[PDB]
């Protein structure tokens, strides 16, 4: 058997090393974030860009006899964004609130979209600065729900209670 | 692990099929004598030329997503020549013999060298037509020894008795 197909790895995570097995290997075309460890004949590191790369191994044996393999690594994003926790909130009706920042992070290098719902009346969400602000118009309790989506469509849902008094 | 190095196979023999495993594979650069069996995702056949070939698999999955592996096949000769059997011989001293042809065959496409020794006196070997002829000058028994060598240095030894009466 010869192994064909993608070698699939997760962007922004430290990969399981890929062992090269049958000698001197010469590896090229590696994505940023990865390189080749002679001493373990392993490709290791953490890839930073989503996409496919075609990697070339030229191997030389003890008599300097040349050989060539190439294969594809596929760097994917299948992990959801993270969101800094937001505690339960309380403020007085008719008073402008201190803005609440939704801080998000993602294993991809990239921007995250937040969809916010269940907001107390009078309050609003600004997608440019990703903050909740405004002036509550009703007393009562709300559950504020945030769906954060990375560029590859992975979603996280975060909730917190808003209490207006 | 990714498999690196030569895939080594024997010239003029029917290979163990190489299974391609992880889909539509597109195979190219195969040596003469081999091709790709879709239904088994196997490379099969019998190679005829000694040497290295670099073979390319482009695989397409169910969503038509492209992938690439390449590897080297190394077609070697490690098998000795064969020689048509020659029976024990008898002829009269002072009489020219009917020439004896040494017929050889080899799994490589190529020429074989025969080294002949232990010949009864008066007899000789012609390397161009590969035949023993001449006129025996002594009565007695000889053991005639033939070393046949292929182009890769694989050797077979064949013997037969010559009786001069
Ligand atoms: Ca992600
Ligand atoms: Ca041979």
Numbering used by the authors:
A (entry chain A), B (entry chain A): 120 to 141, 149 to 291
Sentences from the paper on this structure:
S. aureus encodes a 2,271-residue SRRP termed serine-rich adhesin for binding to platelets (SraP), that is involved in the pathogenesis of infective endocarditis. S. aureus SraP, a surface-exposed serine-rich repeat glycoprotein (SRRP), is required for the pathogenesis of human infective endocarditis via its ligand-binding region (BR) adhering to human platelets. We determine the 2.05 Å crystal structure of SraPBR, revealing a rod-like tandem organization of four discrete modules: a legume lectin-like module, a module with a β-grasp fold, and two tandem cadherin-like modules that create the rigid stem of SraPBR. Further structural and biochemical analyses reveal that the legume lectin-like module specifically binds to N-acetylneuraminic acid (Neu5Ac), which may mediate adhesion to host sialylated receptors.
To further investigate the plasticity of these junctions, we determined three crystal structures for each of two consecutive modules: L-lectin&β-GF (Phe245–Lys575), β-GF&CDHL-1 (Ser494–Thr663), and CDHL-1&2 (Ala576–Asn751). We superimposed each of these three structures over the corresponding two modules of the full-length SraPBR structure, always with the C-terminal modules aligned. The results revealed slight twisting and/or translation with intermodule angle changes of 9.4°, 11.7° and 14.6° for the three junctions, respectively. Except for a short disordered segment at the N-terminus of CDHL-1&2 due to the deletion of two Ca-2 coordinate residues Asp573 and Lys575, we did not find secondary-structure change in any module pairs. The C-terminal tandem repeat of two modules share a sequence identity of 56% and a similar overall structure with an RMSD of 0.81 Å over 81 Cα atoms. Unlike the monomeric form of SraPBR, the recombinant CDHL1&2 exists as a dimer in solution as confirmed by size-exclusion chromatography and chemical cross-linking assays. CDHL-2 from one subunit packs against the junction between CDHL-1 and CDHL-2 from the symmetric subunit, and vice versa. The interface is mainly stabilized by polar interactions, in contrast to the hydrophobic dimeric interfaces of eukaryotic cadherins.
